[PDB]
Amino acid sequence: RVADPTLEKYVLSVVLDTINAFFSSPFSENSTSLQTHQTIVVQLLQSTTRLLECPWLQQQHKGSVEACIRTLAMVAKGRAILLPMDLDAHISSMLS
Numbered sequence: 051r052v053a054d055p056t057l058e059k060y061v062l063s064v065v066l067d068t069i070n071a072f073f074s075s076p077f078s079e080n081s082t083s084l085q086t087h088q089t090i091v092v093q094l095l096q097s098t099t100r101l102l103e104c105p106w107l108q109q110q111h112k113g114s115v116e117a118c119i120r121t122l123a124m125v126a127k128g129r130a131i132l133l134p135m136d137l138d139a140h141i142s143s144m145l146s
Contacts, residue, residue, distance in 0.1 A: 061101075066114045069094065074121045081129060088131040095122055096137055119144070 072078060101107065102115045123141055126133065133141075 062111045062114065066098075066118050070114070070118050070121050073125050078125075079128070081125075084125075085129065088129060091122065091126060091129070091131060092133070092137075095119075095126070095141070096134075098122070099137065099140060116144075 078084065098115060098118055102112070102119065107115065119141070123145060
């Protein structure tokens with residue numbers, strides 16, 4: 051029942067944009083070194099989808115979260131990384 055506006059802005063403005071830019075760039079689709087790390091991608095997936103599921107998210111910035119989810123899902127599909135059953139079902143609920 052507490053919140054820091056500055057921390058919320060930090061988590062909703064710059065971090066999401068940085069992740070989206072990193073995972074939706076021409077130099078990232080190659081995944082020369084991205085193949086080694088997949089646990090971090092899974093952790094980002096779960097954290098971001100939980101943040102989306104949180105109801106307090108305002109519509110103004112729910113879009114950035116959704117875009118990040120889509121981008122990371124596209125990266126995961128190409129990388130063929132392992133997914134948890136529940137997380138995969140939840141993601142597929144919105145993929146189509």
